[PDB]
């Protein structure tokens, strides 16, 4: 086509989606990770995670308002990844890398798994 | 913070949101523009448009599944802007610029209004 493109559009959309999340506006699911709960938008979760894409395209699970993650999933690891989904920013630290990598593997977030593997290999 | 950032994340999220829209997955509103109907995600509309941000933060209108636009709004103009919302790509042409600009003004999409004004000024 003969379209023009607004460079910052995708980033501005994501910033507003994060603002809606922070204000609990039109959030439609709560992700339960052991004792912790995280409110989010199903569409953002699906757009970022192979696991959530699978769950919310399921004819029964698409209608659930609560999703309980595997008890082995670390809440801080999930929190870091949820923030990444809504911002493109990953808070990767020596103290959380193993939990972040395991959570990204479970959530099927290939690019996160990739940088975790690379950061781990550099420290060995 | 000490975060790392994935450059293509925002663009990849938007691409997946557009894929969900094309497959009518978790769309939660229909925008009626005279004889035409457009299915979308309220969160994406709010993230792109001052008008939709106002409508879906309203305590009564947030719960509506149908939104009827002003009868003066051109369906093709709306279609072009809806595509822009989900892609960052604006199909701006001599034959549609007036309708696109009027629709962007109504929807409160300042950056679109700006490029329309600039393209019009260049042709006078």
């Amino acid at each position: 086509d003969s379209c023009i493109q607004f460079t910052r559009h995708a980033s501005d959309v994501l910033l507003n989606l994060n603002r809606l999340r922070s204000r609990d506006i039109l959030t439609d699911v709560v992700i339960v990770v052991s004792r912790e709960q995280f409110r989010a938008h199903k569409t953002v979760l699906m757009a970022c995670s192979g696991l959530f894409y699978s769950i919310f395209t399921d004819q029964l699970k698409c209608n659930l308002s609560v999703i309980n993650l595997d008890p082995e999933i670390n809440p801080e690891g999930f929190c870091i990844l949820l923030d990444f989904m809504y911002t493109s920013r990953l808070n990767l630290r020596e103290g959380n890398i193993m939990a972040v990598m395991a959570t990204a593997m479970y959530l099927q977030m290939e690019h996160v798994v990739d940088t975790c593997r690379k950061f781990i290999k550099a420290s060995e | 913070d000490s975060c790392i950032q994935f450059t293509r994340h925002a663009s990849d999220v938007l691409l997946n949101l557009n894929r969900l829209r094309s497959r009518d997955i978790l769309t939660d509103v229909v925008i009626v523009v005279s004889r035409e109907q457009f299915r979308a995600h309220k969160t994406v509309l709010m993230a792109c448009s001052g008008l939709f941000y106002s409508i879906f933060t309203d305590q009564l209108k947030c719960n509506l599944s149908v939104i009827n636009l002003d009868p003066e709004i051109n369906p093709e103009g709306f279609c072009i802007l809806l595509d822009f919302m989900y892609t960052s790509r604006l199909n701006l042409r001599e034959g549609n610029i007036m309708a696109v600009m009027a629709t962007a003004m109504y929807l409160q999409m300042e950056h679109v209004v700006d490029t329309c004004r600039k393209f019009i000024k260049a042709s006078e």
Binding site: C3, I4, Q5, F6, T7 | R89, L90, T115
Partner: peptide
């Protein structure tokens, strides 16, 4: 705005 750019030519993509």
């Amino acid at each position: 705005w750019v030519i993509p």
